[PDB]
Design a binder for this molecule. Structure first.
Ligand SMILES: Cc1ccc(CNC(=O)c2ccc(F)nc2)cc1
Ligand code: NI
Length: 312
């Protein structure tokens, strides 16, 4: 019965954050395989779950408009100050992207050329539990299929928050819910395949060998290298997934996830070859190459080129 908002339908229920389209393009960020929880349910209006709340987001040239839905049982109102700060932190808007783009452009002509067309690609700062399990589902997969598996995972295991139109929104599950005896069987029924085992076993590992979710917060303040190696102890988490999480959830802007697309970019567009085909060692070397070239926000620079490589 409750419907998704547009900026027309409900203009009293939107707040705005001053935000140029050079600091953020929603359409290049929300569907470029960082988060899998955002959908353009009506044109230029993106809806998705952030924490225990649904949001709809849309922007003009210089403004980011947002609206919150906190549940059927609550007086509908504009986003609060605290809710607006949550969103500001999600898009890491304290960090100037125009300043990073110019620093990257100054050492890399190729980046200059591509960036010109693909402005406002930045990194979301995600919840570690969601990012972890979303990227365990990301192996040998495409964005549409990952999106399906994550949505069904949240429906089956996570709390219902609200329904807008024909879409039921659920919160991301806690570890205990994913770690249970029938968890893998259920997740296989939901189409996850072998990834169902890694989900359940990683949920179990964090709870029994690492102390629950306080461990992921500890990794967020640990140094990149310690976080990465600690992530790689988990079932289904290797170098690539650990670097995605590090970059996207554990505040490591220098993490450079290397897989097929970045290997292809590096070869095709930079002429890079290993000095010592893909391998664990050559992938590591290529991440180091990009850090050396771009600096301590190398992962953000990579996301600009990944998002562009996604738009052909
Ligand atoms: C075909 C496909 C595309 C994306 C994924 C998962 N996302 C990334 O690897 C990723 C996205 C953004 C970024 F900045 N760094 C890494 C899996 C398959
Ligand atoms: Ni070559």
């Amino acid at each position: 019965h409750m419907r998704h908002r547009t900026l027309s339908s409900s203009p009293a229920l939107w707040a705005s954050i001053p935000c140029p389209r050079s600091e953020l393009r929603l359409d290049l960020v929300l569907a470029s395989g960082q988060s899998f929880r955002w959908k353009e349910q009506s044109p230029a209006h993106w809806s998705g779950v952030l924490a225990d709340q649904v949001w709809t987001l849309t922007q003009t040239e210089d403004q980011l408009y947002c609206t919150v839905y906190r549940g059927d049982d609550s007086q509908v109102s504009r986003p609060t100050l605290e809710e607006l700060e949550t969103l500001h932190k999600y898009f890491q808007l304290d960090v100037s992207l125009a300043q990073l783009y110019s620093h990257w452009a100054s050492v890399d002509s190729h980046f200059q050329r591509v960036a010109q067309k693909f402005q406002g690609v930045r990194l979301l700062r995600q919840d570690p539990t969601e990012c972890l399990f979303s990227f365990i589902c990301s192996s040998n997969n495409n964005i549409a299929r990952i999106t399906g598996m994550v949505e069904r995972l949240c429906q089956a295991f996570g709390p219902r928050l609200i329904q807008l139109d024909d879409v039921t929104y659920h919160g991301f599950p806690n570890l205990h819910a994913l770690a249970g005896p029938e968890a893998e069987t259920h997740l296989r029924k939901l189409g996850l395949g072998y990834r169902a085992r890694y989900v359940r076993a990683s949920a179990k590992a964090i709870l029994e060998e690492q102390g629950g979710p306080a461990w992921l917060q500890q990794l967020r303040v640990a140094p990149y290298e310690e976080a990465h190696k600690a992530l790689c102890t988990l079932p289904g988490v290797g170098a690539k997934v650990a670097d995605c999480i590090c970059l996207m959830a554990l505040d490591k802007p220098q993490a450079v996830p290397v897989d097929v697309h970045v290997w292809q970019i590096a070869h095709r567009d930079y002429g890079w070859h290993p000095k010592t085909g893909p391998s664990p060692l050559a992938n590591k070397e290529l991440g180091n190459f990009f850090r050396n070239l771009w600096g301590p926000y190398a992962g953000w620079a990579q996301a600009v080129l990944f998002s562009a490589d996604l738009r052909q």
